[PDB]
Design a protein around this nucleic acid. Sequence first.
DNA 1: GTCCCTTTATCTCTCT
DNA 2: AGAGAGATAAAGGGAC
Length: 487
Amino acid sequence: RALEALLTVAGELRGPPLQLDTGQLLKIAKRGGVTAVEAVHAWRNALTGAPLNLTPEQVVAIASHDGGKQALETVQRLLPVLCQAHGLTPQQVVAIASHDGGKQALETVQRLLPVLCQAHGLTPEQVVAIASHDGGKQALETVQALLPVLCQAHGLTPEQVVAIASNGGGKQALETVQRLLPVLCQAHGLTPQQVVAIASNGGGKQALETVQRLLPVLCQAHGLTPQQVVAIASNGGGKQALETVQRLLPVLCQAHGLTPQQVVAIASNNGGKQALETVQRLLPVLCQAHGLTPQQVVAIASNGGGKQALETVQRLLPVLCQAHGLTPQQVVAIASHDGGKQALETVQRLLPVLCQAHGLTPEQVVAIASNGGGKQALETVQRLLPVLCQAHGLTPEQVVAIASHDGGKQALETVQRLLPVLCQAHGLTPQQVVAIASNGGGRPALESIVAQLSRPDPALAALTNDHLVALACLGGRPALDAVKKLE
DNA sequence: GTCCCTTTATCTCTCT
DNA sequence: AGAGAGATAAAGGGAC
């Protein structure tokens, strides 16, 4: 019964004004549901046209959530009242709106941002942070409710209260800190800093509780220190991570060899449980079928989704090496980040049309993949490389440089965006723009430079454009912001 | 379906 | 280049 309505709406939504594609409408259907896709079909015009002007990807972002219809409805209602009335940018709104029950988060933002700023001294960016989640309305109401007692009875700072509330089930973590802080500190000598670190993670309640019940056991019985424990607790799925460490402590330090430290290191990211289990399974495989060492595997595993990385190393190692002519060290390198599954996969399916259909080396490609988000890097190269070499006069080595960093996608995009405005309007050369973009944070660096030239902050008008450039190159937005307070 | 929560995976910026 | 920390995205389960 679901397929009928999806096929009915689908290649009518694939046309104007949305131009959506398979994967896109797939994402909507399997999270916002058929209602979401129908609502997108219906209000397709009101969403892209003024005064909303929503980009397609932004629409997709609002719909693909339990409630997407309501989220669209409410965005169309209060997209200008929030901007108009609370100086919010439309992107901030779109960010509040793109979670389960965005309609509540939006309505509650409208209703509470004033008091939360005036009565409790939040900045709009803090309020938007609290609301930008699943059960945002709840987090907001619980900040408004609890912030005075947490600050006054428990000695936390407003910032800490915001950190706790800025995740999944923020309310649960706030109330759990309210309940458990004077026990975690009293009877275990933790600090408010530590209790906040534990709670400032999705499922934070379960993390705090699990710490109260398993710290004495992991520590005073499995030979761990409170520091190692809190370390494990201070990521998402910290309860699962803690319990899994407690089970597998003696089932990995005497079997596979792994040491306590290695265990806690693999347990100290998102899905630490998964990564630990996958390590228990795959460590003897990859070391005696792929030739790898313990150290390498533990590296691949000591990341977020480390499980996915382990399993994709298993799956893709020989084929990438023996066909695509990569080496083990290289592959371990590409995998040793957050998203190495996506990295390895994207290398596998793209190394062809970059080496062949362009002229990239596998080493260049490997360097593009060896940086967190590598997938996005590579894909954005594959799109924007003809654009950037035919219509802007860049050499491939330059594009490869720009993508050879975290935020590569962002870097390259922001290059094509502001490639003539700074070169034509302000007199920068291409090599300058590339030079700026070729670091971590190229996108915000380029953005602050354009934001400088097109309206000189006098403290920085005191420098020649070139100095500005070399400055943006050596430290980006942070350094360009730092060399203004010094005056 | 719509809202809230928890767990898990991915991406981007800053800091040296 | 690594680590830390934020942010965004995906998947699933309880509740009504």
